[PDB]
């Protein structure tokens, strides 16, 4: 089956569509209340790590020690049937560079990529572990094309797609994330 397509659409409809519009105000609140001082500096976008290899560790610090958990973005509450006042969780990380706090932003993996990885295990899934990669590529794809026409995506988030070279492991996830942050500084 072609799943990447459906998961991208479920992802947007049940999450991005809902949270992105109310996202920036939530960021602003954290900044005002927590400091309105010192670093503040929480970036204004939702950052979605897109590991093409579909490897998604539950603790972000594990993938890279330089990615440190700061706080949790103030809850969002919504009556998502049948649930009442259903909580939506985002986590705030600060990226370290040579022991220096280089940036602070709302950051997270794309769960759909993780589910994709898990699905290949199951017999009835039924898409081979081989198809994990193309499925991964189709996902980031569909999202871009979805977010392109997203009235909500008034540049509220930035996708971060990456694959780590097979031969060498000199890849720094924090570095990848920092690039986008800095670039958007020159951009913004």
Instruction: Say what angle helices 4-11 and 132-148 make with each other, to 10 degrees.
Output: 40
Q: Which two structure tokens, joined as six digits, stand for 106?
A: 């709302």
Tell me which of ligand C2E, its own copies, Mg ion, none is bound by residue 188, counting a contact when its beta carbon lies within the kind-specific cut-off of 5 to 8 angstroms. Answer: none
When asked if residue 164 is in the footprint of its own copies (CB under 8 A), the reply is: no
Give the number of residues written for the chain.
Answer: 188
CA distance 3 to 25: 33
Total residues at interface with its own copies (CB under 8 A): 49
Q: Are 15 and 111 in contact (CB under 8 A)?
A: no
Q: Is 11 annotated as a binding residue?
A: no
When asked if residue 11 is in the footprint of ligand C2E (CB under 6 A), the reply is: yes
Tell me which of ligand C2E, its own copies, Mg ion, none is bound by residue 30, counting a contact when its beta carbon lies within the kind-specific cut-off of 5 to 8 angstroms. Answer: none
Using CB atoms, what's the residue nearest to ligand C2E? Answer: 14
Tell me which of ligand C2E, its own copies, Mg ion, none is bound by residue 187, counting a contact when its beta carbon lies within the kind-specific cut-off of 5 to 8 angstroms. Answer: none
- DSSP per-residue string spanning 80-127: -TT-SSEEEEEEEEEEEETTEEEEEEEEEE-HHHHHHHHHTTSSSS--
Q: Is 89 annotated as a binding residue?
A: yes
Mask: binding to its own copies, 41-80, rule CB under 8 A, as x and -? --------x------xxxxx--------x--x--x--xxx
Q: Are 94 and 68 in contact (CB under 8 A)?
A: yes
Q: Which of 82, 99, 151, 165 binds its own copies (CB under 8 A)?
A: 82
Of residues 177, 185, 152, 186, the one with CA closest to residue 63: 177
Residue 135: phi and psi, rounded to 5, are -60, -40
Binding-site residues: 10, 15, 86-89, 111
Residues at the contact surface with its own copies, assessed by CB under 8 A = 1-3, 5-7, 9-10, 13-14, 49, 56-60, 69, 72, 75, 78-87, 89-91, 93, 107-109, 111-112, 114-115, 118-119, 122, 124-126, 145-146, 149
Residues at the contact surface with Mg ion, assessed by CB under 5 A = 14, 80
């Amino acid at each position: 089956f072609n799943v990447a397509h459906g998961l991208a659409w479920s992802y947007y409809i049940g999450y991005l569509r809902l949270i992105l519009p109310e996202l920036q105000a939530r960021i602003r609140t954290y900044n005002q209340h927590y400091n309105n001082l010192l670093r503040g500096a929480v970036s204004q976008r939702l950052y979605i790590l897109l590991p093409l290899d579909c490897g998604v560790p539950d603790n972000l610090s594990m993938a890279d020690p330089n990615i440190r958990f700061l706080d949790k973005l103030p809850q969002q509450t919504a009556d998502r049937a049948g649930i009442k006042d259903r909580v939506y969780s985002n986590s705030i990380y600060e990226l370290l560079e040579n022991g220096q706090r280089a940036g602070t932003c709302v950051l997270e993996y794309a769960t759909p990529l993780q589910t994709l990885f898990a699905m290949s295990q199951y017999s009835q899934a039924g898409f081979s572990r081989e198809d994990r990669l193309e499925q991964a590529k189709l996902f980031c794809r569909t999202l871009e094309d979805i977010l392109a026409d997203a009235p909500e995506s008034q540049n509220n988030c930035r996708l971060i797609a990456y694959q780590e070279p097979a031969d060498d492991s000199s890849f720094s996830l924090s570095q990848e994330v920092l690039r986008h942050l800095r670039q958007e500084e020159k951009e913004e």
